Design a protein around this ligand. Structure first.
Ligand code: NAG
Ligand code: NAG
Ligand code: NAG
Ligand code: NAG
Ligand code: NAG
Ligand code: NAG
Lengths: 394, 170, 123, 151, 207, 209
């Protein structure tokens, strides 16, 4: 979907010959959704407040419907609600929220959560209505900067092991988001790892390391770990990746309150376990615009953090080089307790050109671009696509 | 028709003042076209040429926003269109106006808005001011104070100058 | 620095729930005192309200399923300047009441880099 | 007010590379030390000439008793690998009244100035800056060599 | 690992968006500068051989388009809030010079004036007219679409460029469609995925 | 300063046939290159103008094949291969040499009768008489109560032909106060019309409402 009004099918093979192109009359595009899991009928939203329903076929498409929304208002964004219930949430500028019952597509609470630079809010839907559930705005001088939620994950391993078959039980709580606050004159990049349901903070980590606030900073939320990156000076004027890894118990063998036979914990109430964390950071040569995570259908391989730089270059570095609880490698030498083949902490990550994708391509991504990871089969391989001003994949 | 224009204004302006309407662009190729307005007085007529360029080309019978691509003009009652004109000649333009604006209606009167009072029978709306009222799920022109009806062949009569949003069954 | 804490129905009113005070005794150590807590029947889903007259007013900072044997640890959060920054609540088994803790930001590593050696000039 | 001005030229003469593009390589400047501007100064330049001149100017400065301003320049090439890979810029007052220029040749991931307690620490290597700051490709691997080959 | 499938597997598209300004080049006369996709903080400036789709280089510069003007050529640009100005060389985008004291000079870029000189489209079909002796050489059908002629070069390395449809763009030379371009793909906001795919007991034994 | 005149002010033409509409100007239109700079437009009601021809005889993009033009100097012509009822609305000339004015007004009238009446509203008072989809173009609406006519205070609105059946339509409203309106019981809208033979009236008592 273009920023203008146009949809079109691009082939992932054959060097992206245009499979088909359809023109709208919406005059700017905001979002795309498959109306059902069948992947046959799209709904596409106007900037102006119309929506179109389009029939994707091997033939050229047909506009099977155009219609207004309930109120002809300008729309800021749309958040995908349930596949089965066929609901959507629309955030209008003027900060007005609309529940969206689109079509048949021919207690049981739902929680949905949205971010602005003014704050992080949270919202709950009940009884065909939306209600504010809480609010968290930063103060005047402050400004929320970077945000990410927890992408859902298919589960392989409930715990990270040690050399002597001992287990640390990586922390798996699904209702988490993480975010940044930057405050002027404090020069304090504050990191919070917030329960996105309730609002409890669980973690604070500041850095009075002379941040810049002028270079990009970004946050990505992993399987059991979080990475956010910023630029600052006091260690050195260099790009900085910070990794925090969330564990049930820092003790070598403890499953803290995770028995699951029939306990059936409640997040809404707040009797959940709370993690302990271990954090490290690293020294990086080049300024980082934006980060995301590789995937396949099953979260098997190393999750292979992908980075997009200022120059347009892309680079992937594995998850494993970013090991919190790493050691500076004098104390690892037959230190049996650490891990199986623990790669050391090694804060200086030099750039290795072998990693880089777009080997000699330019790939001007424009001011606002996104990285996405498209799963495939053949789990050694994954698609990562850079959509925005320029399109690119690999 | 994808690359199309949009119109802003106010519903009532008194007699004898300049008349503010503001276009808006959601399509490309601003620089290379001549952008003009048109007036259509009710009474079977249309006339305007106020064409402009990215650089000053003012030529009246007109402001532009290259940052926002929202061209603007401040000068009697008429229907007011934005437009898009070719730029064939050097500093003259080449007419050929296509992909028109969707229209503002302007009643140049001293009187004030009056929300349309809506009355079942199909749907009828009594004498109201200004025009127009827009019905949705047939309709003749409103007749002079303006009164307007719609037949069924239910009645979401809606009035932007009054912001009166009234729904009724036949 | 007085804080008042109150749950609200969000339609009827904010019904008061407790009162606390924040004193900066030492050079760089704030602390909380429970001037009084006013417990009444609490059961079910409620939205919280916290207000320190002067500095802070967080009207809806959290939402929990509350119960009258209040067994929560109330994390008020501070920073290098002795000013309240946030207010939030977690569950701790051992209190049978509301007890409050002030928290400093648990400063990050500023992890190390290679350093210049010690007289690698004539050695 | 008196300002600084960076002069420099990446050579591309010892190399025979002349089918280069000059738009994919970018020098960048940052300010760290003793700055009162409520944001450290920063800038980014492109090339000037085929022989490769690049230049910053209108540089803010500290003034008074040996008043220092620490700039750092990032020599990089996205098509080559530049041997310096990091540059320190040191801008102090002379007691005579003139402003002294000194630069140094750091590398990625070491402290710039010593840690304020080491007695007689090691000092970074300076480079001759009469004509200009002279940045260079790697002698031994001038090319970035993104493409790993099988075999 | 990479050398075998270096360009085979990697798959890049370059988009410029709908043109706003196009300026011929001081040297390599089958070459221009392409200005496109304005934004409130910056715009897209690139260099391009006209006789192909071969983009020579691209840059995002932090100026609204109006600052970008020729000299008094050397493509002068002047910030308006401050007095900051950049002089960039057309052929190789070298930043000839910078200042804040004063702009060197400016010349607002001229309008097309292509009609009355080189252009006539009379029988629903285009004819290139010589200014004198209007013999209607190099005539060409109007396609189903036509919006504009972007550019035309009458010199020895002849080239003509048409905004035929809103998003389709055709290059011509001495008529013959010489190359084809599509810039509907210049900015995508949101994305979705569609995949493609292929296409009692005793009786069971025998069948 | 150029004044442009459209020859037919109304051109009733049967569906199907070829036709032509002429236009003239004071000055000459002819560019040095050989362009005339005269454009032809269509406006269906309820819509922004739509461009048909851009040089007097060429065709602009996104226009059907049926339409074409001709002419030069001071006179120019639109011409349709086959007339169809969809192309109903006013047709306009325009010159682009200097100061376009949109002088024109060709009103294609390809037409060379449902009666509806609904009861008064609860509230003053308005009864609606709608003559919708009448071809013959000629109807007059008056009102009748207790054998007395009331043609005064009849606010009428006539819209043009349809694009599908080419049928003219109009509506009439007779507005009285409740004091004025309600003193009589049964009301009737009566119409004199050309397509039918004998005048037709639709009358209503209260009944449902
Ligand atoms: C900065 O200024 C302070 C005095 O305010 C001085 O002690 C220090 O040496 C200067 N340089 C740096 C790098 O801090
Ligand atoms: C510079 O340093 C010298 C060191 O001896 C000192 O005497 C002098 O006061 C300083 N002043 C200036 C202006 O550089
Ligand atoms: C005067 O300044 C110059 C550099 O500009 C310096 O070399 C010289 O030593 C200074 N004079 C004295 C007496 O130090
Ligand atoms: C410029 O582009 C044309 C079109 O493909 C190409 O033939 C020509 O070789 C290019 N110029 C150079 C110097 O390669
Ligand atoms: C000119 O420089 C000022 C200084 O920051 C900047 O704010 C402004 O955006 C620049 N001009 C333009 C057109 O961006
Ligand atoms: C413009 O529209 C035509 C007609 O729909 C179609 O061939 C295509 O979209 C465009 N044609 C060209 C030649 O660009």
């Amino acid at each position: 979907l273009t920023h203008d009004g146009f949809i079109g099918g691009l082939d992932m093979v054959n060097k992206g010959q245009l499979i088909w192109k359809l023109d709208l009359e919406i005059d700017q595009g905001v979002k795309m959704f498959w109306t059902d899991k069948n992947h046959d009928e799209l709904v596409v939203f106007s900037h102006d407040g119309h929506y179109l329903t389009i029939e994707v076929t091997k033939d050229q498409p047909i506009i099977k419907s155009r219609s207004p929304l309930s109120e002809r208002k300008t729309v800021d964004s749309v958040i995908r609600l349930n596949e089965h219930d066929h609901q959507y949430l629309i955030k209008f500028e003027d900060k007005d929220h609309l529940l969206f019952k689109l079509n048949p597509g021919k207690s049981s609470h739902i929680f949905v959560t949205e971010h602005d630079t003014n704050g992080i809010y949270g919202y709950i839907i009940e009884n065909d209505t939306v209600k504010q559930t809480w609010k968290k705005a930063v103060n005047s001088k402050e400004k929320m900067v970077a945000y990410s939620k927890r992408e859902t994950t298919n589960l392989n391993t409930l715990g990270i092991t040690l050399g002597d078959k001992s287990v640390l039980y990586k922390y798996l709580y699904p209702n988490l988001a993480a975010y940044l606050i930057a405050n002027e004159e404090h020069h304090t990049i504050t990191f919070n790892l917030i329960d996105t349901i309730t609002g409890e903070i669980l973690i604070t980590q500041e850095h009075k390391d002379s941040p810049d606030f002028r270079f990009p900073m970004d946050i990505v939320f992993g399987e059991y770990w979080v990475v956010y990156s910023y630029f600052s000076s006091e260690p050195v004027p260099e790009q900085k990746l910070v990794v925090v890894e969330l564990y049930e118990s820092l003790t070598p063998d403890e499953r803290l309150s995770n028995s699951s036979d029939n306990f059936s914990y409640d997040p809404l109430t707040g009797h959940i376990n709370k993690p302990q964390f271990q954090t490290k950071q690293f020294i990086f040569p080049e300024i980082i615009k934006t980060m995301s995570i590789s995937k396949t259908t099953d979260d098997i391989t190393t999750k292979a953090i992908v980075m997009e730089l200022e120059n347009g270059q892309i680079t992937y570095i594995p998850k494993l080089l970013l090991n919190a609880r790493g050691k500076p490698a004098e104390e690892m030498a037959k230190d049996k307790k650490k891990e199986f083949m623990a790669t050391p902490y090694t804060p200086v990550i030099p750039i290795n050109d072998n990693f880089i994708i777009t080997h000699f391509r330019n790939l001007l991504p424009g001011s606002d671009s996104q990285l996405i990871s498209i799963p495939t089969n053949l789990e050694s391989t994954s698609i990562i696509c850079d959509l925005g001003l320029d399109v690119f994949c690999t | 028709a994808q690359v199309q224009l949009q119109q802003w204004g106010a519903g009532l302006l008194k007699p004898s003042e300049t008349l503010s309407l503001t276009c808006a662009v959601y399509g490309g190729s601003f620089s290379g076209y001549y952008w003009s307005w048109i007036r259509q007085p009710p009474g079977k007529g249309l006339e305007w040429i106020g064409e402009i360029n990215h650089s000053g080309s003012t030529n009246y019978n007109v402001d532009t926003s290259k940052n926002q691509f929202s061209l603007k003009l401040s000068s009697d009652t008429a229907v007011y269109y934005c437009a898009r004109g070719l730029a064939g000649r050097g500093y003259y333009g080449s007419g050929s106006y296509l992909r028109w604006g969707q229209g503002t209606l302007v009643t140049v009167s001293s009187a004030s808005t009056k929300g349309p009072s809506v009355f079942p029978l199909g749907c009828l709306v009594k004498d109201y001011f200004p025009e127009p009222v827009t019905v949705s799920w047939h309709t003749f022109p409103a007749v002079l104070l303006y009164s307007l009806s719609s037949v069924v062949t239910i009645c979401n009569v809606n009035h932007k100058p009054s912001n009166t949003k009234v729904d009724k069954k036949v | 620095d007085i804080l008042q804490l109150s749950y609200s129905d969000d339609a009827k009113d904010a019904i008061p729930l407790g009162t606390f005070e924040i004193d900066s005794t030492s050079d760089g150590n704030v602390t909380v005192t429970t001037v009084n807590i006013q417990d009444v029947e609490v059961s079910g889903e409620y939205c919280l309200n916290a207000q320190i007259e002067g500095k802070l007013d967080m009207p809806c900072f959290s939402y929990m399923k509350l119960r009258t044997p209040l067994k929560y640890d109330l994390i008020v959060d501070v920073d290098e300047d002795n000013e309240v920054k946030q207010v939030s609540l977690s569950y701790d088994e051992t209190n049978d009441a509301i007890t409050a803790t002030v928290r400093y930001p648990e400063a990050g590593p500023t992890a190390p880099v290679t350093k210049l050696k010690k007289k690698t000039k004539t050695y | 007010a008196r300002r600084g001005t960076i002069k420099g030229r990446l050579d591309l003469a010892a190399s025979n590379i002349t089918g280069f593009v000059s738009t994919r390589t970018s020098f960048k400047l940052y300010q760290i030390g003793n700055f009162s501007t409520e944001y450290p100064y920063t800038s980014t330049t492109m090339f000037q000439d085929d022989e490769g001149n690049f230049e910053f100017a209108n540089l803010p400065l500290n003034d008074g008793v040996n008043e220092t301003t620490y700039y750092v320049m990032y020599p990089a090439s996205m098509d080559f690998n530049l041997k310096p890979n990091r540059i320190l810029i040191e801008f102090k007052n002379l007691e005579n009244g003139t402003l002294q220029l000194n630069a140094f040749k750091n590398f990625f991931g070491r402290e710039y100035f010593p840690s304020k307690d080491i007695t007689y620490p090691e000092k970074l290597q300076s480079m001759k800056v009469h004509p200009y700051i002279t940045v260079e490709l790697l002698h031994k691997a001038p090319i970035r060599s993104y493409l790993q080959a099988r075999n | 690992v990479f050398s075998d499938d270096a360009f085979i597997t990697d798959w890049q598209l370059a988009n410029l968006g709908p043109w706003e300004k196009v300026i011929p080049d001081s040297r390599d006369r089958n070459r221009v500068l392409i200005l496109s996709n304005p934004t409130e903080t910056s715009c897209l400036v690139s260099s391009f051989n006209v006789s192909s789709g071969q983009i020579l280089f691209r840059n995002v510069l932090p100026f609204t388009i109006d600052e970008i003007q020729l000299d008094s050529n050397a493509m002068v640009c002047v910030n308006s809030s401050s007095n900051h100005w950049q002089k960039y060389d057309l052929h190789d985008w070298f930043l000839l010079e910078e200042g804040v004291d004063n702009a060197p000079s400016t010349t607002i870029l001229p309008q097309s004036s292509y009609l009355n000189d080189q252009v006539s489209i009379k029988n629903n079909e285009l004819h290139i007219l010589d200014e004198q002796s209007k013999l209607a050489e190099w005539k060409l059908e109007l396609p189903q679409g036509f919006n504009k002629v972007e550019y035309f070069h009458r010199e020895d390395p002849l080239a003509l460029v048409l905004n035929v449809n809103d998003t389709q763009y055709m290059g011509f030379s001495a008529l013959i469609p010489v190359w084809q371009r599509d810039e509907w793909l210049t900015n995508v906001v949101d994305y979705a995925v569609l995949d493609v795919f292929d296409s009692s007991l005793w009786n069971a034994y025998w069948l | 300063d150029v004044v442009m005149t459209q020859s037919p002010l109304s051109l009733p033409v049967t569906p199907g046939e070829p036709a032509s509409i002429s236009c003239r100007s004071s000055q000459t239109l002819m560019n040095r290159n050989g362009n005339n700079f005269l454009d032809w437009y269509l406006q269906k009601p309820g819509q922004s103008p739509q461009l048909l021809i851009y040089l007097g005889s060429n065709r602009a993009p996104g226009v059907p094949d049926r339409f074409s033009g001709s002419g030069s100097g001071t006179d120019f012509t639109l011409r349709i291969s086959r007339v169809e009822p969809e192309d109903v609305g006013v047709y306009y000339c325009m010159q682009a040499l200097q100061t376009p004015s949109f002088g024109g007004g060709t009103k294609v009238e390809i037409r060379r009768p449902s009666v509806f009446i609904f009861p008064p509203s609860d509230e003053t008072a308005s009864v609606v008489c709608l003559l919708n989809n009448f071809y013959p173009r000629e109807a007059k609406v008056q009102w009748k109560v207790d054998n007395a006519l009331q043609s005064g205070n009849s606010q009428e609105s006539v819209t043009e032909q349809d694009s599908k059946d080419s049928t003219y339509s109009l509506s009439s409203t007779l507005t009285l106060s409740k004091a004025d309106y309600e003193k009589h019981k049964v009301y009737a809208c009566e119409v004199t019309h050309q397509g039918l033979s004998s005048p037709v009236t639709k009358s209503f008592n209260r009944g449902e409402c």
